[PDB]
């Protein structure tokens, strides 16, 4: 018990040695007014707006940097610590430009409040204010930096979370300007977080410039579907259209940060969006028609076609509830070929054992690892808020990162073992140098990005990695709890698909073409009318008209994750629930119901008729979909290896390369993104 | 006196809520999350019970947002999971409790950034 | 068409409204009236812009006409100032 005892205005709390004075007040429950101190950012002491007075002490101390000592009673509401705030707030406000009705961080200001609660009723600054020169930091951040309180949060985030040290302070005196000395845009993922982290409205979001004002925004808590980290987010909706998506804190998944894609592609959600159910008509043009007519177009073809003549290529952002409603429908009919666009090697246990295909070590385990051998992925642009995880654990802890992929910008110092799958065999043999490095690791982890598995020798790549993990485990003598092998995805509806029993890859549809295909939100080119039977009856089930719509005999519009109470699951299996922020547009309907209804018109009606019932259905297919925010551990790995050992495959010499080589690759990757005007502006800025 | 009953206090027949707004409607007990835009934690301390989001459409004449969900602007505020589950069960609504998410303690030190 | 669009598409049934009636539309677009104004030349690096008034104009903000490259524009009046 190394607790040390310290008094918060008397509550006499007991705290670990090394907790800051500000932290001591927090556990009692008091809040020190603070600027320039963020929990996951280094203490800087720039503002000194947190001056408090420990007892019988000569001067005020900075609650952000003073380690509380033994038996110091903090007096947070003394007559002194209020003159130490009534007089600081005098200064921050003195050089501040009064354009609060321009500053769109109007009600979202941590500087008006603290002025309005702890500061002063009046002003004594009868002199002349200063002005700085607005510069361009990008097409996402509007830096009206005459607002800046030189709190250096931005500089730190830019350097400690995102590894992009482009921002910096220039000049001394009151002239200090926090920016980029030469005008180089702040181009990085994790970029938009600066907005959320600058308490002042100096730099704010340019798309959401002046569309709203925060008191009005109704805030619904939902989940990120753009990437497979499944970052928690809050969708701010006003009068029924989404105005902004900002992060909400999840310790394990996104701890207060969200990607540039899943914050500025809410605009893409509002155009090129399907709404009414059109049906090919006349010469072939698609013609808007009522559900009844469009549904029976599909139902009649479904009754005519038998099993294996009906197939579904789902993929992208479809929810688990639609995925079970599409399987239950096609299986009432004989066809059991439900498939996903992202090919996960099934040549072995495949999906049968969940551990096979789930980051086993959780995102939060990256903090406890000792060496990570990323093979096949550019975590940065595939799963950015997991790249950050390895960013923090390489800085605050000591992770030794090794990449077997293309040498790529990773925001940290990795070891480039090489660009060849077969060198995976080199480590398994113990031939390559890093073989000992791992031998030295007590808690190692290996990450294989699905983006590799998508090549032709992906089955061989998974088997080769499983051999090395087994060896690694044996040599490292790693405990059973640590699970060295994990694989991260880049498609939101993959893990759930795989769990619900959907078989990955369109390989099965390739060998026998289906008379009728019900593409379920699939905008990928995995099959085309060109590769289908002459009949080629195909019906798109989705939200945005992109690739599957113009080659579709029927259009059954659906919703998007802002518009339905569906479930998703990230790579670590943690099932999560999107909440309806806005009602779905036009005649468009929830994905699960379209398929329950088509089944009623077809006559093979599905059992559930309300969503709680579909949640009960999910419980039957895979039981850890009905369970939210819980990661389950049963590492059925040992048997996975046995089947891997049976599988014999050749890893071709072609280097394994992540598709998202540089950030322009990243911006536009999905229907809701490829339709983004903001993403498009970002794409041309890079090009 | 002191009669004994053996059931939840179902007051659904005393509330006066039209059936369809007591049957097909899910309350979501949760402690609101912080506005990333600010760092004040005073709006993440009391448990709220908000209802499902139904249609918010457009008034043809002026373009305003219109609605038919009488229980749309409803955000009851409780003080503990226990007292929110009780009210929902009391009124006959379906609930989706979400556990609180207090930040864990993260150790912060000024000197640390000076090491090399 | 209003300064902010709004023009109804010919097919829009929302056009009956104006039958035997008309459309309230302001002819004085502020996008152009403000452009029909002389860039306020100044000597000082920074200048104020009370909105041409004290308490009868807009909150007073100081604009940095520091780069001839850009004429500072008070976010309230849209007045460009030429260093």
């Amino acid at each position: 018990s190394n607790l040390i005892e310290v008094f918060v205005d008397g509550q006499s709390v007991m705290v670990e040695p090394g907790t800051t004075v500000l932290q001591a007040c927090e556990k009692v429950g008091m809040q020190i007014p603070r600027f320039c101190y963020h929990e996951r950012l280094s203490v800087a002491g720039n503002c000194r707006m947190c001056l408090v007075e420990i007892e019988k002490a000569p001067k005020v101390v900075a609650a952000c940097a003073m380690p509380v000592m033994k038996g110091w009673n903090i007096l947070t509401n003394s007559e002194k610590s209020k003159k130490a705030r009534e007089g600081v707030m005098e200064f921050l406000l003195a050089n501040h430009p009064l354009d609060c009705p321009i500053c769109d961080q109007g009600g979202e200001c941590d500087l008006q409040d603290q002025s309005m609660m702890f500061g002063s009723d009046r002003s004594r600054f009868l002199e002349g204010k200063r002005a700085v020169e607005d510069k361009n930091i990008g097409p996402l951040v509007k830096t009206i930096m005459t607002r800046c309180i030189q709190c250096t949060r931005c500089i730190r985030f830019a350097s400690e979370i995102a590894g992009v040290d482009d921002l910096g302070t220039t000049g001394r005196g009151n002239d200090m300007q926090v920016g980029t000395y030469i005008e180089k845009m702040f181009m990085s993922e994790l970029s938009g977080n600066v907005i959320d982290i600058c308490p002042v409205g100096a730099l704010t979001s340019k798309p959401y410039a002046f569309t709203a004002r925060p008191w009005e925004t109704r805030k619904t808590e939902s989940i990120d579907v753009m990437d497979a980290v499944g970052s928690n987010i809050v969708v701010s909706t006003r009068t029924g259209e989404v105005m902004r998506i900002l992060p909400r804190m999840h310790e394990d998944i996104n701890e207060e940060w969200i990607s540039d894609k899943t914050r500025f592609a809410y605009d893409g959600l509002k155009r090129q969006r399907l709404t009414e159910p059109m049906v090919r008509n006349e010469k072939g043009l698609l013609t808007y028609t009522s559900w009844e007519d469009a549904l029976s177009r599909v139902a009649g073809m479904l009754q005519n076609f038998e099993g294996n003549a009906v197939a579904a290529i789902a993929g992208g952002l479809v929810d688990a509830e639609a995925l079970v409603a599409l399987k239950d429908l096609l299986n009432k009919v004989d066809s059991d070929n439900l498939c996903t666009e992202e090919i996960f090697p099934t040549e072995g246990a495949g999906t049968d054992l969940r551990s096979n295909y789930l980051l086993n070590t959780t995102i939060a385990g990256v903090e406890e690892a000792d060496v990570v051998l990323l093979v096949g992925t550019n975590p940065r642009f595939e799963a950015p808020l997991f790249n950050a995880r390895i960013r923090k654990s390489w800085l605050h802890n000591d992770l030794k990162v090794a990449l077997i992929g293309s040498p790529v910008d990773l925001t940290y110092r990795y070891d480039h073992l090489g660009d060849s799958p077969k060198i995976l065999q080199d480590i398994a043999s113990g031939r390559h140098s890093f073989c000992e490095v791992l031998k030295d690791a007590k808690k190692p982890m290996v990450v294989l990005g699905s983006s590799a598995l998508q090549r032709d020798d992906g089955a061989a790549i998974l088997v080769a990695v499983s051999n090395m993990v087994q060896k690694i485990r044996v040599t490292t003598g790693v405990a059973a709890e640590w699970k060295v092998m994990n694989i991260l995805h880049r498609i939101a509806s993959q893990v759930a698909a795989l769990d619900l029993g959907y078989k990955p890859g369109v390989e099965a549809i390739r060998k026998n073409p289906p008379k009728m295909l019900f593409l379920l939100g699939a905008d990928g080119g995995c099959i085309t009318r060109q590769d289908l039977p002459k009949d080629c009856f195909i019906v798109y089930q989705g939200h945005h008209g992109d690739v599957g719509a113009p080659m579709a005999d029927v259009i059954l519009p659906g919703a998007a994750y802002t518009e339905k109470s569906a479930t998703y699951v990230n790579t670590e299996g943690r099932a999560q629930q999107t909440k309806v922020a806005v009602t779905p547009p036009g005649l468009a309907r929830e994905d699960w119901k379209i398929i329950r209804a088509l089944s009623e018109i077809a006559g093979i009606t599905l059992p559930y008729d309300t969503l709680d019932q579909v949640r009960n259905r999910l419980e039957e297919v895979s039981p850890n979909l009905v369970r939210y925010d819980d990661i389950e551990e049963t590492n059925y790995f040992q048997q996975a290896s046995e089947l891997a050992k049976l599988v014999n495959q050749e890893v071709l010499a072609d280097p394994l390369v992540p598709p998202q080589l540089t950030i322009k690759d990243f911006y536009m990757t999905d229907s809701i993104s490829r339709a983004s005007q903001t993403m498009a502006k970002c794409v041309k800025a890079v090009t | 006196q002191l009669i004994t009953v053996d059931e939840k206090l179902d007051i659904t027949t005393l509330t006066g809520v039209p059936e369809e707004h007591i049957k097909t409607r899910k309350v979501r007990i949760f402690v609101p999350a912080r506005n990333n835009m600010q760092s004040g934690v005073n709006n993440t301390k009391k448990w709220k019970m908000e209802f499902d989001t139904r249609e918010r459409w457009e008034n043809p004449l002026m373009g305003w947002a219109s609605t038919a969900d009488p229980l749309s602007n409803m955000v009851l505020t409780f003080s503990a999971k226990e007292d929110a589950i009780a009210f929902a069960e009391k009124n006959g609504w379906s609930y989706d409790v979400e556990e609180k998410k207090v930040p864990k303690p993260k150790s912060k030190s000024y000197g640390a950034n000076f090491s090399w | 068409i209003t300064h902010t669009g709004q023009v109804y598409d010919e097919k829009d049934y929302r056009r009956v409204r104006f039958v035997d009636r008309q459309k309230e539309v302001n002819e004085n677009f502020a996008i152009d009236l403000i452009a029909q104004q002389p860039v306020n030349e100044v000597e000082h690096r920074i200048i104020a812009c009370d909105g041409g008034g004290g308490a009868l104009g807009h909150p007073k903000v100081y604009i940095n006409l520091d780069k001839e490259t850009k004429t500072g524009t008070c976010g309230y009046c849209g007045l460009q100032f030429k260093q």
């Binding site: 090129q272 709404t275 009318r529 | 457009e58 373009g63 | 669009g5 008309q22």
Partner: peptide, 27 residues
Amino acid sequence: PATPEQYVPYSTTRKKIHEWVPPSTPY
């Protein structure tokens, strides 16, 4: 120091949504 000019309201909003326009020629 009966009239036709009657105020009529709008939705001065720029329509806030965009539907996919189907492909012009068939496949």
